[PDB]
Design a protein around this nucleic acid. Sequence first.
DNA 1: GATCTGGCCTGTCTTA
Lengths: 340, 342, 222, 522
Amino acid sequence: MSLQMVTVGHNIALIQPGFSLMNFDGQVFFFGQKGWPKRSCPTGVFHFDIKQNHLKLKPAIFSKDSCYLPPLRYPATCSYKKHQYIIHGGKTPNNELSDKIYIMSVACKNNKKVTFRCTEKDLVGDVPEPRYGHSIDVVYSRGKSMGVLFGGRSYMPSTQRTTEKWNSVADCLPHVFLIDFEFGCATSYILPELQDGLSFHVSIARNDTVYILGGHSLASNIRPANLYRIRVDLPLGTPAVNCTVLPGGISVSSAILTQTNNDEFVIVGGYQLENQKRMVCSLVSLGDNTIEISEMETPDWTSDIKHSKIWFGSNMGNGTIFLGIPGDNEAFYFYTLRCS
Amino acid sequence: MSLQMVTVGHNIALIQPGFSLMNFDGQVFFFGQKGWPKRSCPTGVFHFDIKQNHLKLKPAIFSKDSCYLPPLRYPATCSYKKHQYIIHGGKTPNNELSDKIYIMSVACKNNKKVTFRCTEKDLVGDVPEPRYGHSIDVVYSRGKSMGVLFGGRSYMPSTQRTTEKWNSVADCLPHVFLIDFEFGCATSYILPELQDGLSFHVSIARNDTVYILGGHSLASNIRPANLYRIRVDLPLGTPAVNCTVLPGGISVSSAILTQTNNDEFVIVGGYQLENQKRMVCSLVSLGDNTIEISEMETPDWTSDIKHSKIWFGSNMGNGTIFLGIPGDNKSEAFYFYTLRCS
Amino acid sequence: TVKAITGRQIFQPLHALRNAEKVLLPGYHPFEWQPPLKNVSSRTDVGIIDGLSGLASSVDEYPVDTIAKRFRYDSALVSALMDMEEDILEGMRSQDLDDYLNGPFTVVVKESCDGMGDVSEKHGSGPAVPEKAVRFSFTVMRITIEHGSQNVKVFEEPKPNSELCCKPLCLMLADESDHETLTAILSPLIAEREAMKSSELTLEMGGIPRTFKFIFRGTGYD
Amino acid sequence: TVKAITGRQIFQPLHALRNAEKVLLPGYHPFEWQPPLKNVSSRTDVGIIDGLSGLASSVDEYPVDTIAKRFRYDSALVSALMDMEEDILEGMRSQDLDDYLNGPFTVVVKESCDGMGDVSEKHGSGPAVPEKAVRFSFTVMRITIEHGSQNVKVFEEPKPNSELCCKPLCLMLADESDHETLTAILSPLIAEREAMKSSELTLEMGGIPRTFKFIFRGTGYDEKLVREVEGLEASGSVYICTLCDTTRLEASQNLVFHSITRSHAENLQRYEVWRSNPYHESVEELRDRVKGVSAKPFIETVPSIDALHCDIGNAAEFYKIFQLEIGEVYKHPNASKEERKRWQATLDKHLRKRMNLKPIMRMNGNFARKLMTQETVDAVCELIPSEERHEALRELMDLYLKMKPVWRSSCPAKECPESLCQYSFNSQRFAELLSTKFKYRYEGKITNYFHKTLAHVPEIIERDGSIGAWASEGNQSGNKLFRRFRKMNARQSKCYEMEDVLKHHWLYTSKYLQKFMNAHNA
DNA sequence: GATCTGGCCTGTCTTA
Ligand SMILES: [Ca+2]
Ligand SMILES: [Ca+2]
Ligand SMILES: [Zn+2]
């Protein structure tokens, strides 16, 4: 709980609301820059570096058998354990919602010179509709890793999408998918407890139960104060799921989740109401089948933040939050936040 | 016979056409800036110094008993022998003409610092009307000095001056005026060989004679190639003035006069016709009573002067000539070239 | 002043002109495409609509701070054809044809676009508008009928680069380098263009239905 | 179009209008001065006289790179008076005065001069003219007649700040700081002005020869041009006020008691002392004696205050005070530039989100008027953590709003007499507030317009009558018309645009036509 | 041979 300014270099324009700070062995990496990649970095993947409260951005290349992916703006990022990440969904700079899974993995490194491997993976069966503002998590159950995906929001289907409302977006159907990363099979499930869709939520992952918290519903235009839980099982045959509501929910839209300690997740403010900005932070501590929430001691916020209307950011991995404030007319003031 | 590029400092705007450089024991001093004197220098007189072909200006102060003079754009400079100069006529920053006469001098010197004594001098008798673009010289006749004034333009008289032709100029009368520096008195002398008013000419002086070269005449719009020999004499009574026309004239207006050595001057610049700017030089020779105007080598002019339209400058004293040309504007307003001839 | 001095109504009041304007503006004349337009409605009374095309403006999603106004392409072309009916009829009469002909016409167009800098911003309420501007226009070039066994032109533009024939279509205040906003604004127009590149129009000229098919060409791009 | 469609002529052709224009333009009505004008021709048919006034343009003479056009001053006055015949007649008829009276009317005229900028140069042949443009205009303000032992106000302009009554006089293309060309062009105008300032005009309108006497006033001059023409240094000097001769420190100490002793002949005397130096003093002693005069004056101006620039300066100063208040400078006398940048950005964003305003480079006019509200003080106090600062700013803005209507109304003695009667106390409390609870900024320094507002406003109000009806904002409004006319209503040639723009802007400010457009109101 | 002086610069404020 300590704020600090950040002096960025020259390429501040390459940062936009909706980026993703992927982490690989302490080396935080950038993704999702504004516009198509120029000739300074045809890959669009940058190596984050903060020293003496100063920020620098340098390019990075891929392997000889990689796939140059377009820079997305709202993907679903999740860790995996061979440490690699999963990218799904997103919004291309041409507003074309991608429905293809990309996998990041470091394949070579020598004196601060890395080389990624962006493989390509499609899906079969109950493939998800291309969307954004959603989340995906991995689940370990009985010596097996399975990916759980939750619905988000997307454009109108190819039938009712009229030109007068070509950019209208509604919440997707609240289903639950199981994606096998080894094979690429996605199976569609239906849960009676999940009544309506949800987007921009927070998905907390653990051994075998995913914790959904907060979000925003576009249909009813309401920010619920509920928290959900999805336990699953991986028997020798067909899987099994579950979902039950829980008391003590939190109403947050587009939060930023990070990890302070093992089984001790802290969360920062998001959006409380439409024109009201969340300020106080919460703390999530888990047991075995329990939860815990508590209003922490809010950090000393600056005057510019106490009146800014829009703010964004993401996680850094090392218990640190990188958020930004829009300027005027240089264009984005960037602050950092450390937890414990 | 060399032409050199000159780099100027920050206040290049303080130089305008019509200035008058003054020399004092190897030190050239600038005068006649643009506009009223600002707070960077409450006097206007600046120190002229060129080091490694670079130009830098330096302000200067006056003495206690001085008289703060306004800038003048077309005075009548004249050397004198302690050492001192004479300033007469010119155009005030308010486009008005000044009939007053000034006597600059040196008051003190300590570590390259010079103090002046600007003293206004009263003129009584046949005072001339306020003029500009003329010349004045000093003649020596039997251990006595006397100032010779001739030429100059001026506005219309007080009666005929109308606000529809408020800026119309007319050549003054060809009268010759002897100015006495001791009593501060003048006297009007008329000459029969003088019929057309002349302006922007060149006055070459000698022991007791002064010579006239070129100029312009508004009454006829002609640049005559005249050569007048005025021999002022100072007897124990009333002075004597005589004129004489001589062959071998030059058709030039607003030329630059410099002194490489005694009894020989160098003339460069000016104009032959309205749009035909003079390019060739001219060498004179002052004998006992004769004069010989001849051609010399033509210095290598760059591509800027050959296709320019106007230029200005004055003498520096050490056989060098300060020359400037109009630059661009959006950039540097002017360029400046020094010329060497010795 | 004219009515006060003379005492006779030589000109009509402002409301008469405001009422007469509704005849020339698009979304007034009925029409119908042969093969129904894909992803396009059938309302023939669609005038000036918001250029954002229903883009979300919530604080949660990608912040948008640009305003836009535009017509609908097909209605724009219908209004353009209604505007130049007399010229088409005169061209048909000149080439020794019949006025009651309804053969499939061919209309080629020329699209254009450019970014405009130095467009000051006003005070007041609303989103933060950037100090730029981007336009989008089109222009018909030559109308051709297929008579007999070959083709012949009916109406070609005499002054191709004249401002008097540059029909505006879309207007917005955004940077020409803001690729995201630019695509978000121009994607509906491109979708309409793609849908219209494989259809035919039925239109009434002088009381007789006519057939139209288009050939799009975009060259006015630096 | 109308003639071809309607088959008749509702309108007249162009040549008829051209022929009719020659009546409103100067040089068409006879007149004569009973005292002959010195150095001014008595001919009465001159039109657009060249601006250069026959300046020598030879190659040997000082170079000329400017063009100018203008009228004769007296002919312009005659034309302006003949344009307002009906108004004067109706004023005499309404004030219970016989129309055939020919008393010695008195006319007061307001002059103005401003230097424009960013005027694009054109191609073609001619002299290389600069881009800065300068104009000079006048305005007939009020007229009285001496009936018995009184002075009946027969006519007063109802809108002394409208562009519809600012009649042009001269145009040129030169820098305002270029002191040579400026004087070379403005010398004949000042000459004619000083000449006719000692005569009387007679002419016959309505079949009766009348009598006129002029009393000119020069107030439409911004502070910079006042410093220039009156023979003063720049504004950043220590002698700040052009009405009183106090220094910076003495104006930052007293703030209250300052009379005015600064006439036009006094400047000439000051310059003569500075030139002759009769007491053979040093630089500093002689400068203190002359109170900072180093240039011969050439224009007789009225020692007044420009209301528009005063409002702009006050708004800018206040804005800076808000910036300093937000940053808590009184608590931390040290601050980096980046802190200043962030403070200004925060203030701009807050004013944008709470006052519907946008960031601007230079202080505007509408931004000034709209920034000076109680709700603005509230929005600014929404950022200050302290609470006494809040009340301080509240009292500051209250005093300023209490002092504002004095120097902004067309007649304070008849609209807001309470503010005028209570102006001295309010000004003293304002100065005391600044001195006590604003020491971090106003310790030993004060700008021009605070001194002007806190020192000389009551005296100017009680002497000249009103402030605001004598501002320079009319010339600024006319600058717009000049731009539009030069862009769309003139010959696109380098040696033909000036006379066309001058003629068109003269015709646009003729009340004779303004009466035809108001027919609906009959 | 440190020790002030002079001038050179340099950021800030004041009108536009
Ligand atoms: Ca362009
Ligand atoms: Ca101006
Ligand atoms: Zn004062």
